[PDB]
């Protein structure tokens, strides 16, 4: 009942004072807090309220109670920070166990309250009710923990680790090893808490930061500054790099994978390399704004909106149409477009991924996140030392785990592994592209045979069961491996690895993959394109080839390419270079001209080539106009030789045996 | 070379040149279309001069500007009381004295929309006084109904003013008092004229309906009339 609920809330509130309090003799305005008794029992019973009740009833009500009484912010942080600062001063000089006991048990609650949140069709209605609100409260937690004394609780958590670093692994009991798992399990949460995702019941078709929270409190930029001052990056670096020497790998190296995922996520590598500067580029951007303004002006009438006359347009067969406005009098292109634009209908439309936190897989990544200069250089230093120090030893362990455990996996661990691989391999390639001090040997553990098998196997199994999110990530990982191979061939075993990578079975898979992309989201198709470009380019420099290229060329691939190309207002300069490379391959080299004589391509080239779309001076117009010229020349030749193609141009090609051969050629 | 945008034109020159003898009549009978044609002719000619004579002037600057013709000396002046319903939408010429001018009124020309959920934006063209609001948000992944909304202070506006013109005593009927007519004037010509000024004008003689109440589309049978000036002298 409501009264039983509030009785438990009141029980918690009383426990929220039995804990202790600051001293009003002190005349120190204010002092720190001061300590209660039964407090062991207080902490333990709170732990029981989580584990023995809320978990067993699947509620999150208990968390709502502790959030009501602000336990984290009010007691746990000063209890820990006082323990830390006391022991720090004692170390400067250079029952006490009971104090240390309190330090352990306060931290374990911090891990529990900030643990990240999952919702399914098997979660209770209680949890589904409370999801949106507890998100707000965890955001408050992240801000607070990073703020206190400029984040000093984070020194307490690593000092706890330092006690268990201390003495030889040969001594270290299972209970002892849990501390070293626990500490790293904390930092994962503090990075993982981020602004909410809005969710509603789909009964009818019709921000969540609380008043005390703002973006600069919560941004990844902040977290960098906070960890650096409070001495975290040294701990993650030392701990990962000596990992091979007999720290029991089993307890550390998955939590330590999740950290690296959880703050590589949302960085584009180009933002870490530069390739008054801000003001200069701002001025240039204002020039671009002026061009857009000019485009609007070129469609704007001189005289006002009620001056306008009326226009009539007569067709062949003497039938007439009517359009209004003063620009229609002079511009037939505009009149024709304006005529169709009035018409009401649009055909309604069809729509791939859920269950996991925001990442490259389901967001447009043409949108950076933003760094102070000190933060930029500190972050660059952290991951550069990580790569030069830790990467091979980490990947070798985590991969030779997962080969023995693949059957037992869960979707997240698959998507973590595939987006840790991808990031670090790409970033190193870019860094050594830039400079000679860097080298490729640092990432060279990715190529050895076991990992290649494992990325292959993940992609295989994901594709067969029609799990499209793992398939998407696996596509991204398998792209980079191929990219790295072409690098190393441009310098023995690598050719053996290629020959095994391009057994016939895999060519069947990698040929299959663009065909299904037509239905799905804009990123999926983009992954398919970039993988295809790489896949063909390697086999070009193998010297088989004619068998493989004919395997790619057919209607359902071309359909995907156009369906992707028409959203060009959103895409990069580089991706369109890739698409026209492929059309050059289909049209000129392979001489399979009949695929592209289809009408929705001819519309597209007008839109994109018009004064509407692609800029008059972008590099894209060089490629596009050089393509269309050749297109229309060959089309002219075909149409005059055989006039039936006028009715051909609307429809798909015709698959009958007796007429179809002459049709295609 | 003076950086200016309007060209005077006395209509008698259209009668002197043989190829435009009929264009003179078409101007009086169809002003709204013919004047627009003349505007887009002048702008193109200005561009042609700099590109043909290959001069140093910025093509973008000329493309950005609006150019307008202002015809005048069209024919005989017409008595204010003798305008009849067969003169609607034809060019007229009037003489008179200025009584008063209202302050400048902002007139909207372009509307600005923003999506409430995904922050997509669209600029829309105003014609015939009606805002062509979109049915759904046009961003592909945010194809939602009622999702766009108007932002007043990011629209674009233009100046309108109303001038009250009185009949000159030379035309008043015997034993009667002079009448007056209202002139609508835009952009360049807005603040030109003061109380007590004596002028001659040229503009289309227009008429429009008026509503019975502000709640509903019900119109009255009598129509309001006014003059839409394109030149003042």
């Amino acid at each position: 009942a409501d009264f039983s609920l509030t009785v438990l809330r009141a029980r918690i509130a009383l426990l929220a004072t039995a804990i202790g309090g600051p001293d009003y003799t002190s005349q120190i305005d204010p002092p720190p807090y001061k300590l209660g008794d039964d407090c062991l029992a207080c902490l333990k019973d709170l732990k029981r309220w989580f584990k023995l009740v809320d978990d067993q009833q699947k509620r999150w009500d208990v968390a709502m109670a502790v959030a009501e009484y602000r336990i984290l912010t009010d007691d746990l942080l000063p209890i820990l920070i006082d323990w830390e600062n006391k022991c720090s001063l004692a170390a400067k000089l250079a029952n006490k166990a009971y104090y240390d006991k309190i330090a352990l048990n306060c931290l374990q609650l911090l891990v529990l309250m900030t643990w990240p949140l999952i919702v399914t069709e098997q979660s209770s209605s209680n949890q589904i009710t409370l999801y949106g609100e507890l998100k707000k409260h965890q955001l408050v937690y992240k801000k607070t923990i990073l703020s206190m004394e400029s984040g000093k609780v984070l020194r307490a958590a690593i000092r706890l680790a330092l006690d268990v670093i201390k003495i030889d692994r040969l001594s270290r009991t299972p209970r002892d090893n849990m501390v070293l798992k626990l500490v790293l399990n904390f930092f994962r949460n503090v990075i993982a808490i981020e602004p909410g995702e809005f969710t509603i019941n789909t009964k009818k078709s019709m921000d969540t930061l609380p008043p005390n929270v703002s973006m600069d409190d919560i941004s990844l930029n902040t977290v960098i500054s906070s960890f650096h001052k409070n001495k975290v990056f040294g701990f993650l670096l030392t701990l990962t790099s000596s990992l091979s020497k007999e720290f029991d790998q089993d307890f550390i190296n998955i939590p330590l994978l999740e950290i690296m995922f959880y703050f590589t996520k949302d960085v584009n590598q180009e933002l870490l390399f530069p390739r008054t500067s801000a003001g200069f580029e701002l001025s240039k951007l204002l020039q671009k704004e002026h061009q857009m303004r000019k485009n609007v002006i070129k469609h704007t009438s001189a005289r006002h909106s009620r001056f306008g006359g009326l226009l009539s347009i007569q067709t062949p067969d003497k039938t007439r149409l009517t359009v209004s406005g003063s620009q229609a009098l002079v511009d037939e292109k505009i009149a024709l477009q304006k005529l169709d634009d009035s018409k009401k209908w649009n055909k309604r439309i069809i729509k791939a991924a859920e269950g996991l936190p925001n990442s490259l897989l389901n967001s447009q990544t043409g949108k950076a996140i933003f760094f102070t200069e000190s933060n930029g250089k500190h972050f660059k230093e952290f991951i550069n030392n990580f790569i030069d120090s830790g990467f091979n030893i980490l990947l070798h362990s985590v991969t030779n785990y997962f080969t023995t455990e693949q059957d037992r996996m869960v979707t997240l661990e698959q998507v973590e592994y595939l987006l840790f691989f991808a990031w670090f391999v790409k970033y190193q390639l870019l860094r050594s592209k830039i400079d000679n001090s860097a080298d490729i040997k640092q990432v060279s553990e990715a190529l050895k045979e076991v990992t290649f098998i494992l990325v292959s196997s993940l992609l295989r199994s994901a594709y067969d069961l029609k799990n499209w999110t793992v398939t998407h990530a696996g596509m991204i990982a398998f792209n980079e491996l191929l990219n790295l191979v072409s690098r190393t061939k441009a310098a023995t075993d690598i050719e053996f690895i290629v020959s095994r990578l391009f057994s016939d079975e895999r060519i069947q898979l990698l040929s299959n993959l663009p065909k299904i992309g037509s239905k799905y989201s804009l990123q999926f198709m983009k992954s398919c394109i970039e993988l295809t470009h790489s896949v063909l380019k390697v086999l070009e420099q193998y010297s088989n080839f004619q068998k493989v290229q004919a395997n790619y060329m057919t209607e359902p691939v071309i359909e995907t390419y156009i369906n992707f190309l028409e959203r060009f207002r959103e895409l990069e300069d580089d991706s369109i270079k890739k698409v026209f490379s492929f059309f050059h391959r289909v049209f000129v080299q392979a001489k399979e001209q009949a695929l592209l004589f289809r009408f929705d391509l001819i519309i597209l080239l007008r839109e994109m080539l018009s004064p509407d779309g692609l800029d008059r001076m972008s590099r894209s117009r060089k490629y596009v106009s050089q393509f269309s010229d050749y297109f229309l020349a060959r089309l002219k030749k075909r149409l005059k030789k055989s006039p039936a193609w006028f009715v051909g141009l609307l429809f798909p090609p015709l698959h009958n045996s007796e007429v179809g051969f002459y049709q295609r050629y | 070379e003076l950086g200016t945008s309007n060209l005077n034109l006395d209509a008698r020159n259209l009668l002197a040149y043989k190829q435009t003898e009929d264009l003179y009549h078409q101007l009086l009978n169809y002003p709204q279309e013919v004047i627009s044609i003349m505007d887009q002719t002048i702008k193109d000619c200005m561009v042609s001069l700099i590109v043909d004579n290959n001069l140093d002037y910025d093509l973008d600057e000329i493309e950005t500007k609006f150019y307008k013709v202002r015809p005048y000396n069209v024919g005989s002046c017409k008595g204010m009381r003798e305008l009849n319903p067969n003169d609607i939408d034809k060019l007229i010429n009037l003489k008179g004295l200025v009584l008063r001018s209202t302050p400048v009124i902002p007139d909207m020309k372009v509307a600005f929309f923003k999506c409430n959920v995904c922050d997509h934006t669209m600029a829309v063209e105003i014609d015939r006084g009606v805002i062509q609001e979109p049915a759904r948000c046009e961003r592909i992944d945010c194809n939602e109904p009622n999702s766009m909304s108007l932002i007043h202070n990011r629209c674009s506006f233009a100046d309108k003013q109303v001038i009250k013109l009185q009949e000159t005593p030379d035309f008043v009927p015997d034993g009667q008092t002079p009448h007056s007519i209202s002139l609508c004037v835009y952009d360049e010509l807005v603040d030109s004229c003061r109380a007590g000024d004596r002028i001659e004008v040229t503009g289309t003689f227009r008429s429009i309906p008026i509503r019975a109440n502000s709640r509903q589309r019900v119109l009255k049978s009598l129509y309001k009339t006014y003059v839409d000036v394109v030149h003042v002298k």
Partner: peptide, 11 residues
């Protein structure tokens, strides 16, 4: 219940 996230929300 037909719970659903605004997966498309990215501004």
């Amino acid at each position: 219940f037909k719970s659903r996230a605004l997966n498309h929300v990215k501004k």
